[PDB]
Amino acid sequence: GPVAESWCYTQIKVVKFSYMWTINNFSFCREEMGEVIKSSTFSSGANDKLKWCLRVNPKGLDEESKDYLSLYLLLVSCPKSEVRAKFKFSILNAKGEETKAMESQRAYRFVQGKDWGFKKFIRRDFLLDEANGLLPDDKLTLFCEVSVVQDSVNISGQNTMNMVKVPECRLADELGGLWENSRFTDCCLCVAGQEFQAHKAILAARSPVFSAMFEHEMEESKKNRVEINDVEPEVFKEMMCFIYTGKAPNLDKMADDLLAAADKYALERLKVMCEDALCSNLSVENAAEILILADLHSADQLKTQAVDFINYHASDVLETSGWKSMVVSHPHLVAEAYRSLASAQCPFL
Amino acid sequence: GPVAESWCYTQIKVVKFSYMWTINNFSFCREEMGEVIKSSTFSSGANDKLKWCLRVNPKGLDEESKDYLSLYLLLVSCPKSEVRAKFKFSILNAKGEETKAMESQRAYRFVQGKDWGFKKFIRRDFLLDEANGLLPDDKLTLFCEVSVVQDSVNISGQNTMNMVKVPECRLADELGGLWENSRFTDCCLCVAGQEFQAHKAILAARSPVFSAMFEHEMEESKKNRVEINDVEPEVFKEMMCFIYTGKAPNLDKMADDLLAAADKYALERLKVMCEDALCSNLSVENAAEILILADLHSADQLKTQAVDFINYHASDVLETSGWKSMVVSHPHLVAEAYRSLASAQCPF
Amino acid sequence: STFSSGANDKLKWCLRVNPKGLDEESKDYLSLYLLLVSCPKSEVRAKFKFSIL
Amino acid sequence: GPVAESWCYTQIKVVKFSYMWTINNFSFCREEMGEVIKSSTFSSGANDKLKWCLRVNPKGLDEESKDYLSLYLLLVSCPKSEVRAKFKFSILNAKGEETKAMESQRAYRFVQGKDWGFKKFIRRDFLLDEANGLLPDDKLTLFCEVSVVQDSVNISGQNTMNMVKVPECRLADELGGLWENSRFTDCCLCVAGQEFQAHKAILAARSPVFSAMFEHEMEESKKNRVEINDVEPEVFKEMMCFIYTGKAPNLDKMADDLLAAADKYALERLKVMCEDALCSNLSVENAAEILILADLHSADQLKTQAVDFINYHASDVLETSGWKSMVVSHPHLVAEAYRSLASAQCPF
């Protein structure tokens, strides 16, 4: 049984009657063919508004039956529009067990005055026979079962999926919020006159450089009044945003001096983010100073990509005054570029 | 496995419905040829405006369907114009397996009031044969699923290009290193005599109760030392590992008391995480105990799921001795179970 | 669109047309059908008449 | 025709793209069998999201179309899932009429990158012979017209629910009565000695230039009297018969100076609707006097439409003496016309 997410339970209400119909002194039928005996009206607890009755002909109702008992069912009151029904009849013998039971194969509709039943019910001679016990002590016993169907209803239920939904990771969010809110600050940064503030453990975890003068028993002097003079405060605030959160929102406008800050403080992750930022602006004129900053800050991937770019576009780099100043002030780096261009991407002649 | 300069991932959106549909007293078919009986309109959470319905003819649709039960599927609600879907019908037998599970090879174009189905679905006499088990206890149990597709989407990725890449993030690893080489910490706590050390701001960032305890009536006098003698250290160290790392590796072995710790320290994600763990560890022989803890430690959706599980398996849950202790200990939970099962059996 | 009158507002109806047809007899026949979309009672009898302005 | 109590108008929306296409020097087709030359991507103003294009095989697509010019219609990009359309192809002759036009009876299904059309569109030798005149100056021009169908909407118009009805709006009629009956005005103006009567608040309700003049320096001392001595009363009465009634009945007969007053008094809606009249009265013999007004009185859409008319009819606008007067009076208009003509004739 597969699990579903929606389902419907179409239920059609069905009720069952239980009726007894016993007539005494049946051998005194007192009439010839074509005469009926209407029963007493009966119902059940619900809905108690459908009044049923039975008509029975001891002799044959028609010339075709004659030597035949015939039994019918009739409905006399219908508060609704119409009612379809099923029925099973039976003759109770001397012992009381059901014999000669015939039922209806269709759900016949009934209106007030409509009858349904078996006119060819049982042979009258077979009933009047005594060996089968169908007429005990001049009593005729009949067993009536009437089943009534009602209008169909659909409860319908949407089954449960309702699995556990978990929240996302929040550590970056609350640690970043802890950065601005600065609850229970332990150290007071100083940057170009600004007096920033931060904790101690997160810094000594992010940067080996910070833990260098923190592990060497330098707490009571340097932690309260730590002085930093290299980085400007805007970039310095941005790199603590990186320290506490792990994100660099506006790196694209400050990729150079934040790379200088990353080189100073050994934040290798931010080093490679600055490599990322300064890679994707490679124009034919700025590659000289890109090489300058790459060699000054010991960058690897950005330096290699800049060397490949200047080897590709040396037709226009050489005209720039940055390249001439590069050649003058940096003897070794031009030689390194010559080395890389020598045994790569021109060995075909 | 070559690597390319670009990559296109053309994805077709697919939504899979599931549907149970059960009939009682079918042998009283009530009508001749031409009868149709409809089902209820059903849909999943997506998109909540694409409703479907079944439609079955008991005796048959036409004269050549005299000895055939015909089954159809009708689309009743669709805001858009054209929606196509490929469906599969089956019959759950007495045990519950599918029988004549047939599929349509095409995904027909459906519109507002369009029907498709198998007119020659199953034989009438083959269904009404009792030896086949196709009518268990005079009940028809069909199982319906439709696979609906939407307009395909193109992500249009473009890899290689600039070689630049991040060497991920070392945050969790270095905060674990803070567990490793001890720390010049902020505060020394006490867990049943055993000495643990942890910082203050990191606790105050992720826990309202720690921030409430730290800055009120303790930051002036007893800032260094505080004692917790309520949660045992073998789960306490793991809860502090959740505070430091953002995740808990060891949850399923020992979620029975760390969820109590999560309620005691108001960590919402950790509550939900152990809630999911105990939801996966629900079983018949302990569901009363999961209900006891879910009511004791303010779990809500876990309480609802455990109540639903007990409603599903109420026959054998009553046999376990845990329910008998639960009756005399917490009668309100028993009343709540009766309350929920009353709504479950509202029609009957 | 589904339609009914004010009373009793529980028997909703709608129409359906096949512009080309349904079967091989209706290759050159427009077909019009009327169906009942919702009913609270068990069954309802009716007679209908169609027209083209 | 009886009136029914319920009705429902079913509308399936249809839009239309009207298209010109023009190719030079068709004798230089430059290739044999197998060549295609495309067209630019085109769309209409609404919704400006359905992008179509064309393609033509100068020799043919298959061996059955060796002597057939092949034509197809192609859908390059669309935001919706699927679009159907009915299309019609045509060829313009030398005289400017349509010849050998043929269309398709079926609303074909189009999707991203699918073509539809007639491979056997026209006979290549029939185009090649000059007797029919279908190749004017070795150039081919195509008339393409396509209609796109859209989703169904039903308005479901219910009638005879309520016999009562509200008479929309008579407020414009009473405000028109405020001008004719003059209904105890407050401030009496003076237009070239003639006396007109106006109320005070409802002028400033719509006029930004009156709201500034009425409260500053005028209401304190000379509140009853102020003089307008630049606009003639024959059009000033028609102008004031808009601020009250919300409309202008007598527009076209003196739209030449109504727009002159419109930018003078900064009435935005009056300026646009009089720009409508002066755009509708565009012709070759008055384009100079239209453009001089559109430049002196800060018209923008009128100035754009006028210069676009002059660039297209510049063969005979230069013959007019008003153009010669505009040249010697306003050189900047001539410079703007040269700039727009250079932008139009950028490829040459």
Curated annotation (Swiss-Prot), chain A:
Outcome after substituting residue 68 to C: In NSDVS2; dominant-negative, increased BET proteins stability
Highest taxon, organism lineage: Eukaryota
Region (Required for nuclear localization): 56-176
Effect of residue 106 to Q: In NSDVS1; gain-of-function, reduced BET proteins stability
Biological process according to GO: proteasome-mediated ubiquitin-dependent protein catabolic process; protein polyubiquitination; regulation of proteolysis
Occurrences of domain BTB (ranges): 158-282
Phenotype when changing residue 129 to N: In NSDVS1; gain-of-function, reduced BET proteins stability
MATH domain boundaries: 16-146
Effect of residue 202 to K: Strongly reduced homodimerization. Reduces the activity of the cullin-RING-based BCR (BTB-CUL3-RBX1) E3 ubiquitin-protein ligase complex
GO molecular function annotations of the record: identical protein binding; molecular function inhibitor activity; ubiquitin protein ligase binding
Effect seen on changing residue 108 to A: Strongly reduced affinity for substrate proteins
Tissue expression profile of the protein: Widely expressed.
Outcome when changing residue 118 to A: Strongly reduced affinity for substrate proteins
Record annotation: effect of changing residue 178 to D: Strongly reduced homodimerization. Reduces the activity of the cullin-RING-based BCR (BTB-CUL3-RBX1) E3 ubiquitin-protein ligase complex
SMART domains given in the database record: BTB (SM00225), MATH (SM00061)
Residues covered by region (Important for binding substrate proteins): 108-118
GO CC annotations on file: Cul3-RING ubiquitin ligase complex; cytoplasm; nuclear speck; nucleoplasm; nucleus
Pathway membership, UniProt: Protein modification; protein ubiquitination
Effect of residue 115 to A: Strongly reduced affinity for substrate proteins
Subunit structure: Interacts with GLI2 and GLI3. Homodimer and homooligomer. Heterodimer with SPOPL. Each dimer interacts with two CUL3 molecules. Part of cullin-RING-based BCR (BTB-CUL3-RBX1) E3 ubiquitin-protein ligase complexes that contain CUL3 and homodimeric SPOP, or the heterodimer formed by SPOP and SPOPL, plus a target protein, such as MACROH2A1, PDX1/IPF1, BMI1, BRMS1 and DAXX. Interacts with IRF1; this interaction mediates IRF1 proteasomal degradation. Interacts with HNF1A.
Disease: Nabais Sa-de Vries syndrome 1: An autosomal dominant disorder characterized by global developmental delay, impaired intellectual development, speech delay, and variable behavioral abnormalities. Affected individuals show congenital microcephaly and dysmorphic facial features, including round face, small palpebral fissures, highly arched eyebrows, and short nose. Nabais Sa-de Vries syndrome 2: An autosomal dominant disorder characterized by global developmental delay apparent from birth, impaired intellectual development, speech delay, dysmorphic facial features, and additional anomalies including congenital heart defects, sleep disturbances, hypotonia, and variable endocrine abnormalities.
Misc remark: Antigen recognized by serum from scleroderma patient.
Family under the similarity heading: Belongs to the Tdpoz family.
Described function: Component of a cullin-RING-based BCR (BTB-CUL3-RBX1) E3 ubiquitin-protein ligase complex that mediates the ubiquitination of target proteins, leading most often to their proteasomal degradation. In complex with CUL3, involved in ubiquitination and proteasomal degradation of BRMS1, DAXX, PDX1/IPF1, GLI2 and GLI3. In complex with CUL3, involved in ubiquitination of MACROH2A1 and BMI1; this does not lead to their proteasomal degradation. Inhibits transcriptional activation of PDX1/IPF1 targets, such as insulin, by promoting PDX1/IPF1 degradation.
Protein name: Speckle-type POZ protein
Biological source species: Homo sapiens
Gene (name only): SPOP
